[PDB]
Every structure is written in structure tokens, then in C-alpha cells.
Amino acid sequence: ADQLYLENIDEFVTDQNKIVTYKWLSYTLGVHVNQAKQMLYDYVERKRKENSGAQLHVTYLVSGSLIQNGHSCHKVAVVREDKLEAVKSKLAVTASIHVYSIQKAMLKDSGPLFNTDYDILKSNLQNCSKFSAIQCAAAVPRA
Amino acid sequence: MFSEQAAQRAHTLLSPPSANNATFARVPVATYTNSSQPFRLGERSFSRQYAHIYATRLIQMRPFLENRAQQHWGSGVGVKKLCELQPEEKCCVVGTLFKAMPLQPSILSKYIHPDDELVLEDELQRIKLKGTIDVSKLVTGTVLAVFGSVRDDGKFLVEDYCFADLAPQKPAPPLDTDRFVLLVSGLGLGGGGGESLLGTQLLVDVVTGQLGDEGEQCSAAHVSRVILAGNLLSHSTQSASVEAVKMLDEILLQLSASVPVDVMPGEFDPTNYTLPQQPLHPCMFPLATAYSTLQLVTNPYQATIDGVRFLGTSGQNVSDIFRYSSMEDHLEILEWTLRVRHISPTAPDTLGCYPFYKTDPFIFPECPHVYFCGNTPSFGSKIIRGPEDQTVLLVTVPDFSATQTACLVNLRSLACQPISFSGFGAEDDDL
Amino acid sequence: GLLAFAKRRNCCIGCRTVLSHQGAVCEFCQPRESELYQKEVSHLNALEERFSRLWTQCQRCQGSLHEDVICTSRDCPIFYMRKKVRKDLEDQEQLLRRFGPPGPEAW
Amino acid sequence: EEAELELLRQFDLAWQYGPCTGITRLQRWCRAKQMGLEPPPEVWQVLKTHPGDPRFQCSLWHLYPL
Ligand code: SF4
Ligand SMILES: [Zn+2]
């Protein structure tokens, strides 16, 4: 159960030296999207409670309301591991926190995090609403 | 509105795995009606001349201006044709402007110049105009009524003048549960950055139901429609375009899976040039034409989405008025376009159109509840009132390639909220 | 004389092979059809832009915006350059109706 | 005939029905009737007792490379 995905993540991350988003880890193991975020949080909590000095880097996502000049906007950001709490304190209302990615050796910008999702989409084209939380009804291939 | 409701629950996602995770359903779109039939052109015969359009514009717009000058200057009326005027006598004239500007290019950045004349023109003759009138706020093609007298040098002295104004507006039924509508413009696929790529990915991931907690997934499930408004492929130089339609087909596939989508042609898009732009041909989209949730529509677009009626363009009239006038605020130019009862008054003189001959279709025959624009450089929204009970919400849609901002319109409270997307860049706060 | 007794043989837009039926593409060159539609609509687009710049210039050289143009001035380049774009547009509009319509029109 | 050819030539130059040298004669007659300016019921009653003749059912300058 737990050792299954724990060993799968430990060979995907530290051995093949890859970059694991939640959508890649849900197209590999055939899992729901929210359960995949929970899986990644489980792995990072276990290996950060075990050792505290791993070769492990995280990136999160923060979403929520804001007011700049009167108006109420809705700001959504993919954030690094240092700057989380300041971004959390700038916001007014908080609406979504989960985990986005983990790494071995630190990147410089948000470059390859689009390459990964794009390439795993490229071969998997007959399903994108397969693991989606919203299942509409009138959209079935007809024409 | 939206982000208020998105925090209305409990948060489950910083937790170890569970037995179940919640799912939802897309809200039904149980009423829709396209009523943009005067812009869909089936016959398309050229070989006429542009004089049939001005004549029917004057003949249709004349009783509105007579009926407004009566109740705006008193029913002791002095409305008179341009030839039956006697020297130095008080009268009202209804005509068409023509602005005589040099620096406008002929066949062989603003273009307003400190000297340029206005000329009031009717079907038979013209007359010059001076007095108390704005020289640089007005453009060629507006039809208006005016008050004054013929002086001795053949010119005309103007005291005050009036425009046509808003058309009637029937009231809409109120709604039970709030449904939202998302508006995007100008993705710019073909060039324009890599932060735009992650911005487009995060936008489609939010609306399809892949991102965020049960708050975001409950609130994005209520978004009923998606409208993409023009300028889908921003082009760097024509003489590239073949590889971009593949990626646009993939994106429209990933959106046609969950939501209904409406796609409009823009300034650069593979269609014609004249103003009732016809829909895109389906032979450039192999993948996305599998589903009956994708629709391709005219550049001028009317609809009746859940009782609320929409009308919009991809921002070709507003920038044309911006070229040959002095107004800067795009929301103001949109409201001014509403005030003279014409979607695009500068056509045809500096913005090309088809040569119609039966009826000019850019005159408003009714008043829309929402009226939006296209590729404007910054967000803006406003509410305006009519003389009668007429209220109109005005939205200017930003351009996604620079700002990365879209708009949510509520269909029960009739308000508009911006949404912005920003991944982290090459940012290091220790330098 | 003989020019009236036409047959008007249709031709493939890709490789110029005369054939029976009205479809635009050839059976060997059918896959590359989205690119062949992409090509030539950027030509119709540039003919449309040339019609409008010319036929409204006569309205400003004439004086009036509400009455017909009558000027067959043989020393003006405007005359007979405004005559050929009508036929270029007439021809290029009919070549794209080889392809079907992009939607219905009687709804 | 020869009196019916001046009535149509008089309908074609009256400015209160429109600027018409690009279209047919009966289309301009119905355009004015829709807006109901005042089309007279005699320029209709010669466009019905004829077939498709090009010297009744055409504008005055339907030659003339303008
Ligand atoms: S054809 Fe040439 S000379 Fe004649 S009105 Fe047009 S622009 Fe002027
Ligand atoms: Zn061929």
C-alpha cells in the first residue's frame, strides 16, 4: 500500500533524477489528482521527518483573494520553498494550498515545469477529463 | 462573488491519502440562442460602390435625431434642409460629419493635427462649421443634429448639438443560483514568452478542474461558458502560421472536453479583412471537431446567454476611433460608441467593411445588457445609466500575453472580477 | 470567337492535375489540405484590403460621400486600377468556395 | 414604348429614392418601398408586363466602366 508508492517515488526522484509534478504522478500510477497531491505530501513529510537534510526541494501553490486598489482580484501563484509565508501574509483570504512539485537539484526558473506537463500530455491525448474532478455530460465525441 | 465562496469549506489537501476524494458536475446551459444572423454573409457579391451605405445610414438615423431635438430644444421646431436656409435665422440641421484632416495617408501613434476642419454634409451639398464645437473629439461618420444660423461668409455658427443616444431595453429575468462566465482575449500563440505558456496552462488547469482544493473545484464547476475573443495567434511578421494551428487545436481539444467554448476571429486570424468577419473553416482543427461543445462564431457576436444578452467585438472599432481622435481611455471610447448609436461609425472611411446596400447593420436596434470590447491594454469595468430605465455594464477585456488576466462576469449580481495568473520566475531574493 | 466554347476543366490546387469532379484537392495531395487552405486565404485577405483603399479614394477626390462616382479620367492611375481588383476578388472568392462553407446560414 | 423608356429614366435620377448605379432597378424599387419613402405604382407596372429585357431591368449606366 504505502510502500508501493513510497518506493515508486523514491526510484523516480532520487535514482532516475527526474522532475515529478502531480499530473505526471497521476498519469503514471493512474490516480485521482487530489489523491496524488496527498501522496506527494505524505512522501515529503516522511522523508523530511526522518532525516531533515535530504537533497529535496519543494514548490507549492497558493491561491486566494486580494485587494490592490479597492477592487477584489483573485491571485493564483506557484511559489518556491523560501517565500511561502510572506506571500501568505500579503493575501486577504486564503482558498487553496497544496503541493506542486519536488526536485533533486535546484532549477533557475519555471522553464521545465511546462515541458514535463506538455510531454506527458503529448502521448496521452484521448484522456484529460479521465481524472478530472468535474464530469460534464453533453461533451461526448459525436461529430 | 467567486473567491468569497471558494473559502466556504474545509481544507483537505495537506494530509496523507484518503479513501475517497470528491467529484462534481458541470452546471447545465439550459438556454442559449445565437442572434448574430445579420453578420453571417451567405451570398457575398462585391462590385458595388460605397455610396449605398451612407444614404441608408442617414435615412434610418434621421427620425431619432428629429425626435430628440424636439424634446431637447423645445417643440417650437425649426428643423430645415440644408438648401432652404436663409441668412441669419435660427434653425436645426440633421446631417453627417466629415473631418477634413491632413496627415491621413492616401494611396500615392495618433494622426490628429492642430488644424483640421469639420464639414456637415447632406445628400445634396456641404457646409463648413465653426463656433462652440470640439474639433478633435469627433470623427468622420457620426450623424447628429445641430443648432444655429448661416452667416455671411457661407459658414455656419453652432451653438449646441445633440447625438442619437441609447435604444430601448427590455428587462431580464432574475436568476436563482449564480452562474459565471469567463472572458479571455489574445493568447498570442506563436510568440510572446514562456511565462505566457505557464499562465495559459494554469488557466486551463483551473477551469477544467485539475487544480486547487474542493473550494476551487466547487467554484470552477459553476462557470457555465467560455468566450475567447480574437487575436488567438499573434504574428511577428507575415512576409510560423502552420505550426500554431496545431497547438491551438490541442488547446481547444483540452477545453472542449469539459466546457462549452465560443471562438472568434481577430486582427490576425485566417479569415477575411472586412468587418463582418465570417467563422473559421473547420478543416484546420482535426482533433477538436470531435465534440459538439466547440463553436466557431462571427467576429461581431451577439448572444442570449441565460436571459442576459451579450454583444461584443475583438477590439477593432475602438482602436480605430483611438487612431483618429483625442480620447485615450478605452472604456470612455466604448461608452461614446454606445452614445452615438453605432458600433463603428468610422466605416467605411478608415476601417474597411463590406459594401452593403439594403440596410446598415451597425446601428443598434436594441440595447444590450452587457457590452464588451476586445484586446485592450488594461482591465476596466463600469456601469452606466440611460435616460429611461436602461442600465449597461461595460467591460474591457485585457490582453493575456502581457498582463495574464481574464474576467469573470456574474450573471445574477452582474459584476465583473479580474483573475490573474503568475508563476514564479527567475527570482532570487539574496542578490 | 472560339473563346466562348469553353469547357472549364477544374484542376487540383496542389499539383495541377485536371480531373473529373469539383473538389479542390487531389487524392494524392489530400492530407496537406489545412496548409493549402491556409495558403491563399492570406491572398484573399490582401485583395480585400486593396478594394477598400481604392474605392473610397474616389469619394474624397470627387467631393461627396452620398452620390455616385463618375470619373473615367485616363490620366489618373485610380481609374482602371479600381477596375481590375473587382475581377481579382471575383476570381479569388470563387476559388475558396471549392472548399465547403464554414457553417450554416439559414438558422 | 418610347414613353415607358422616359419614365424609367426619370425614376433613375430622382435623388429621394437613393444613389443607385450598382444594382438592378426592381431592387431599388423594393428598397425604397421597405423604408416606404414613396415609390410610385407605375414604375412597378412596367416591370411586370415585360420579361428579362436588359433595357428595362437595368440602370442607365450599366455599361460605362465606372
Ligand atoms: S479614378 Fe482617379 S481621378 Fe477619378 S475620381 Fe478616382 S481617384 Fe480621382
Ligand atoms: Zn493533387
Tab-separated table of N, CA and C in Angstrom, chain D residues 5 13-15 17 20 22-23 27 31 40-43 48 57 62 65-66:
chain	number	residue	atom	x	y	z
D	5	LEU	N	-39.837	54.374	-71.764
D	5	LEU	CA	-38.396	54.474	-71.598
D	5	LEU	C	-37.944	55.817	-71.052
D	13	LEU	N	-33.078	58.976	-61.698
D	13	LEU	CA	-32.275	60.137	-61.332
D	13	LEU	C	-32.925	60.986	-60.251
D	14	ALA	N	-34.055	60.548	-59.707
D	14	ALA	CA	-34.667	61.232	-58.579
D	14	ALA	C	-33.908	60.880	-57.312
D	15	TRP	N	-33.372	61.894	-56.639
D	15	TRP	CA	-32.468	61.698	-55.514
D	15	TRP	C	-33.159	61.223	-54.246
D	17	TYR	N	-34.925	58.573	-53.777
D	17	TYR	CA	-35.040	57.128	-53.682
D	17	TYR	C	-33.699	56.422	-53.522
D	20	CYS	N	-28.380	55.148	-56.904
D	20	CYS	CA	-28.387	53.795	-57.452
D	20	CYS	C	-27.800	53.699	-58.853
D	22	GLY	N	-25.391	50.721	-58.960
D	22	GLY	CA	-24.626	49.496	-58.861
D	22	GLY	C	-25.494	48.261	-58.874
D	23	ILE	N	-26.807	48.462	-58.813
D	23	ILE	CA	-27.759	47.399	-58.532
D	23	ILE	C	-28.806	47.412	-59.631
D	27	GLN	N	-34.715	46.021	-57.523
D	27	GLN	CA	-34.167	46.007	-56.174
D	27	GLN	C	-34.229	47.386	-55.529
D	31	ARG	N	-36.306	48.436	-52.244
D	31	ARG	CA	-35.585	49.073	-51.146
D	31	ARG	C	-36.295	50.326	-50.673
D	40	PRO	N	-43.644	55.148	-56.648
D	40	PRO	CA	-44.927	55.300	-57.337
D	40	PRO	C	-45.351	54.007	-58.007
D	41	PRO	N	-46.661	53.711	-58.051
D	41	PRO	CA	-47.144	52.443	-58.614
D	41	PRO	C	-47.320	52.470	-60.131
D	42	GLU	N	-46.321	52.991	-60.831
D	42	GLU	CA	-46.249	52.921	-62.281
D	42	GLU	C	-44.899	52.436	-62.760
D	43	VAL	N	-43.826	52.723	-62.021
D	43	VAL	CA	-42.514	52.154	-62.291
D	43	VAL	C	-42.476	50.688	-61.861
D	48	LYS	N	-43.481	44.485	-64.789
D	48	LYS	CA	-44.236	43.252	-64.687
D	48	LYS	C	-44.781	42.788	-66.025
D	57	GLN	N	-34.862	46.277	-67.322
D	57	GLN	CA	-34.463	45.847	-65.996
D	57	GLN	C	-32.977	46.099	-65.737
D	62	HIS	N	-25.387	50.943	-67.015
D	62	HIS	CA	-24.959	49.583	-66.687
D	62	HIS	C	-23.903	49.077	-67.663
D	65	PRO	N	-17.571	51.963	-67.929
D	65	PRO	CA	-16.697	51.283	-66.942
D	65	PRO	C	-16.560	51.876	-65.536
D	66	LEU	N	-17.271	52.946	-65.187
D	66	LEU	CA	-17.413	53.366	-63.788
D	66	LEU	C	-17.989	52.255	-62.908
